[PDB]
Design a protein around this ligand. Sequence first.
Ligand SMILES: [Mg+2]
Ligand SMILES: [Mg+2]
Lengths: 361, 361
Amino acid sequence: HASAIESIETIIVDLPTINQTLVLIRLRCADGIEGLGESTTIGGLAYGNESPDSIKTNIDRFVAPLLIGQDASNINAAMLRLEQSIRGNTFAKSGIESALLDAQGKRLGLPVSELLGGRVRDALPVAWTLASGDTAKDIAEAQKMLDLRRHRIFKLKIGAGEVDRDLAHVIAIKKALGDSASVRVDVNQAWDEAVALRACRILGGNGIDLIEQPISRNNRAGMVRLNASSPAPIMADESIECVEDAFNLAREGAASVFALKIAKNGGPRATLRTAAIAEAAGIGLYGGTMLEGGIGTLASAHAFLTLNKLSWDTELFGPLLLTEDILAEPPVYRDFHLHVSKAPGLGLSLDEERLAFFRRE
Amino acid sequence: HASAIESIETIIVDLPTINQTLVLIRLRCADGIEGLGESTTIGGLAYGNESPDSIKTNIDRFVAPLLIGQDASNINAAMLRLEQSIRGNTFAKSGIESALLDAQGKRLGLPVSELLGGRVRDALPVAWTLASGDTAKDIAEAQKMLDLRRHRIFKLKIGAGEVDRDLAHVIAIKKALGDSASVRVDVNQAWDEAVALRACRILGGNGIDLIEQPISRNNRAGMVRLNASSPAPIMADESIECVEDAFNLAREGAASVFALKIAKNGGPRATLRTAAIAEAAGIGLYGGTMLEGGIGTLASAHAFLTLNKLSWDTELFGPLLLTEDILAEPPVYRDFHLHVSKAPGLGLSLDEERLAFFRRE
Ligand SMILES: [Mg+2]
Ligand SMILES: [Mg+2]
């Protein structure tokens, strides 16, 4: 009549942006406590093998049956029970663990960061992706975010256009901002090593601070070679699809910085194991996102608050892209940071009206 | 008036065995809650650079001043605060974290295993070291422990005598027990690779299931080479003196099994990070001990209860060597296992009378 998991509801929500689809998880226990989680991805199946649609399918058909009736207060046991019968599906697992953590936090009256060991900071620096595709527009937007003291670290997505044009674009943005901001790029696996070996040298010699996943996660030997030739640090993102990938990447020397995404590792706890491996290997950390709304963003944040050091900051700006979220109170952003409260669990509540209005069904 | 750390007392205790020195840590908070921890080692400075004497010295002079006044409920912050100003001293750090975990467990009314995420088992298999040095005596003792259903996994310490005599000794013990028990050896770094390369082949071909730290932790390349030539798995023990060592050993391929000792890693939490690295690398786990009494043994046990798998079992028999401990109620051993309760914290209480009688001062 207390901690037993009573029900797990998965809801697909479509929210307008400045459309983003989220998968909300509502986990309820026998004692009335409800935990909220979020499994969100980008562009259907273009950025991962799990879509919001298949996440709901697999949670409803396989995850729920395994957890209904289980003690929600033993999260390690619940997640291992899942790992025993379910391969992959890390996005789904991440949402489920987030919900369990939120519920256990409420149950003990402690924020998730404390359940995870204890925070060493209350705020996290938040970078911003400039996505207009227009050099002039990006520079203006960056200067705007700087003036409003919202962001001072900017990320540029490149790789889709002609290499020299992408490079000129990013370099022109850094040149305009100078030392007033940190400029990084994400190539999303777009380049072949033949192109990256030259492009990384150019970006590194022109003020770009970090080069995220320049080539395919499949060119394992190539990522190692690029770490040696690139004068700028390389960060692994897509190369990490589970905690074990983190170890293998560190063993091989495939990247000097690891992006930490709860969706890719299977939840905050799994993400902290990936962080532990990176730290033990002397690899830098970055708080990554799959553009989650407030729930997923805070689930990530609470884990990041416990890290000794986050040398490369975070990109937890997902909520800032939504013209409307399903939360009664959005996360707090001020002076270049995301400020995380000490409220129990994830410290957020659902706005039932907006949920009913935006839920696909 | 609640969680602030009020005092930290270190007590050196000498207990008779079937003499063992323990370093008891008594941590008291402003709310009256007391946490108990244990920093224990073997033979003064023969098995580590920290002696019970220097552990007390460094805790009193450097650790205590850093923690008095700090919030005992944020263990991650407290331990990182220590890591910022204190190099090494993992045995001392282990005792301190154990005390903090015990106190926080009492504070929340949860066993340490739950604070660490949640147990997946309530009992742990416990091996037994046969140390008579006499083949006949060891066989008789092993058969005795089997009959009493106390132990079915036996460890033999070798390396001090002539190689062929040590090998004959261990092989004769396994031959007598047959498949009724698992026989392993610990060479404690005693052999040179020149000797180990031949000895491991002999032991592996004669029923020895595991070879613990056959050579010096300093012969890094040698440990890797032995993993290839030995038909029996090699376990790293002394090679692990911090979490980072675990990563480097996994990267190099220095051992296929890792011993997990809270004293060597700096506490239950650090030990779980080492375990996470091992698991991510496909390396087997073993619950190790530095012959701690009940407190240290249970601190280790609570961490081990959370591990998905402990393929090589544990050697948590430290309390069984003491003719008397400082605990009112000793740990529970039955049917080849150590049974861990769900009592708050480490679930143990100090016998004030025995402590007063055995404390060195
Ligand atoms: Mg990326
Ligand atoms: Mg050993």
